[PDB]
Paper text:
Ufmylation of CYB5R3 depends on the E3 components UFL1 and UFBP1 on the ER, and converts CYB5R3 into its inactive form. Ufmylated CYB5R3 is recognized by UFBP1 through the UFM1-interacting motif, which plays an important role in the further uyfmylation of CYB5R3.
To determine which region of UFBP1 is required for the interaction with UFM1, we prepared a deletion series of UFBP1 (M1–M5) and performed a pull-down assay. This revealed that UFBP1 M4, which covers amino acids 116–214 and is conserved across species, is essential and sufficient for the interaction between UFBP1 and UFM1. Analysis of the secondary structure of UFBP1 M4 revealed that the region comprises a coiled-coil motif, a β-strand, and an α-helix, and the β-strand contains FVVEE; overall this structure resembles the UFM1-interacting motifs (UFIMs) of UBA5 and STK38. We crystallized UFM1 in a complex with the UFIM of UFBP1 (aa 194–202) by fusing the UFIM at the N-terminus of UFM1, and determined the crystal structure at a resolution of 1.6 Å. In the crystal, UFBP1 UFIM bound to an adjacent UFM1 in a head-to-tail manner; a single UFM1–UFBP1 UFIM complex is shown in Fig. 4e, left. UFBP1 UFIM has an extended β-conformation and forms an intermolecular, anti-parallel β-sheet with the β2 of UFM1, which is similar to the way that UBA5 UFIM interacts with UFM129 (right). Further, three hydrophobic residues of UBA5 UFIM, namely Trp341, Ile343, and Leu345, engage in hydrophobic interactions with UFM1. In addition to hydrophobic interactions, UFBP1 Glu199 forms hydrogen bonds with the side chains of Lys3 and Ser22, which likely play an auxiliary role in increasing binding affinity. An in vitro pull-down assay showed that a UFBP1 mutant with point mutations at Phe196 and Val198 (UFBP1F196A V198A) hardly bound to either free UFM1 or ufmylated CYB5R3.
Author numbering: -10 to 79
Write the structure that this text describes.
Amino acid sequence: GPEAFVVEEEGMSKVSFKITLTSDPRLPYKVLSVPESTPFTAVLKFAAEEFKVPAATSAIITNDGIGINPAQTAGNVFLKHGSELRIIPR
């Protein structure tokens, strides 16, 4: 019967973030894409590499300026915060 048809999961396999270095008034950005299951620590590592800044002294925050727990997936960050993120010194 109809109870036997279930939407078990839904998502998007490729997650894209537009990460802006907002301390620089030219607002340099990178659009980075990663698998949905990518640990967010690896997104910070990728972004720091592309911006040529040390991952250890950098952080990624939401467009609204709030911190993100790194121990979650890229897909979950996108679900909560959308695509626009900022890279800042920590």
